[PDB]
Design a protein around this nucleic acid. Structure first.
Ligand code: MG
Ligand code: MG
Length: 218
RNA sequence: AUGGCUGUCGUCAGCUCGUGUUGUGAAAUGUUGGGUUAAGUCCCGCAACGAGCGCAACCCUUAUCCUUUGUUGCCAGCGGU
């Protein structure tokens, strides 16, 4: 709400012409983001997220770029919600019947990796199990407790995970995702202009959204 | 006209299916890409996520040792020839 003004961003020298009504002219061969349309649009998204959080809709925090890959996990897991920080598996939302079998394996291997096998088979075989355990856990993480399809999708990056936005679009899942000056503002339910690939910027949204979801919990 | 049983490509490393996505469609992706192996063998990336038949292992023989038994098999230490 025009507090710090630290998400100018500009994301590149060039632009995306579909982002014309959300920019301010910059002489440094870059493109400003107009905060006047940024603040109210963020407020609308927060209000609708509060609206839908009253039914435990399982909001998803999807930030994959290495800048936000930790802050997203913190702001999602450590408070109430799910997340996807590593590579978005192709079709994990629409090929749900096939993806769920992987989470079943993750749960079984987690059960057998605590009081299970330590010497029953070869130590290198247990190492293979641990290797697969880490590979499956880091890629397929917080969504492990998912009951099925979610209700909302909060996507940190804009262009990085177009397959995530399209996967949500195939269903009737609303999408709240911030959009840079070089991204595509179409197909996203709630346009939020702003910079993404910065530490401060992602933390701003991951704090605001986290507080809103916490207060909408009950 | 067939069953069964064989050779061959070739012991070559390939051949496929389910769901998802792409294309009006035939089809494609998975199975491509950077490395490595004898092998789509393995790892990392990745609109793909998994599974099957293959490869490897599971099997017989050979290279060393330990245990059990000592015949029609053996003769190191003891005595007679
Ligand atoms: Mg093919
Ligand atoms: Mg194989």
């Amino acid at each position: 709400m025009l507090k710090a003004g630290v998400h100018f961003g500009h994301q590149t020298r060039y632009w995306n012409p579909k982002m014309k009504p959300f920019i301010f002219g910059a002489r440094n061969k870059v493109h400003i983001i107009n905060l006047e349309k940024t603040v109210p649009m963020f407020n609308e998204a927060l209000a609708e997220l509060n609206k839908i959080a009253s039914r435990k809709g399982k909001i998803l925090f999807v930030g994959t770029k290495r800048a936000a890959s930790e802050a997203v996990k913190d702001a999602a897991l450590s408070c109430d919600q799910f997340f996807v920080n590593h590579r978005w598996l192709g079709g994990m939302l629409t090929n749900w019947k096939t993806v769920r079998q992987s989470i079943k394996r993750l749960k079984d291997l987690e059960t057998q990796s605590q009081d299970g096998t330590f010497d029953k088979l070869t130590k290198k075989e247990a190492l293979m199990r641990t290797r697969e355990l880490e590979k499956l856990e880091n890629s397929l993480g917080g969504i492990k407790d998912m009951g099925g399809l979610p209700d909302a999708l909060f996507v940190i990056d804009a262009d990085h995970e177009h397959i995530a936005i399209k996967e949500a679009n195939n269903l009737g899942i609303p999408v709240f995702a911030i959009v840079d000056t070089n991204s595509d503002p179409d197909g996203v339910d709630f346009v939020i202009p702003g910079n993404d690939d910065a530490i401060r910027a992602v933390t701003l949204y991951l704090g605001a959204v986290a507080a809103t979801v916490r207060e909408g919990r009950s």
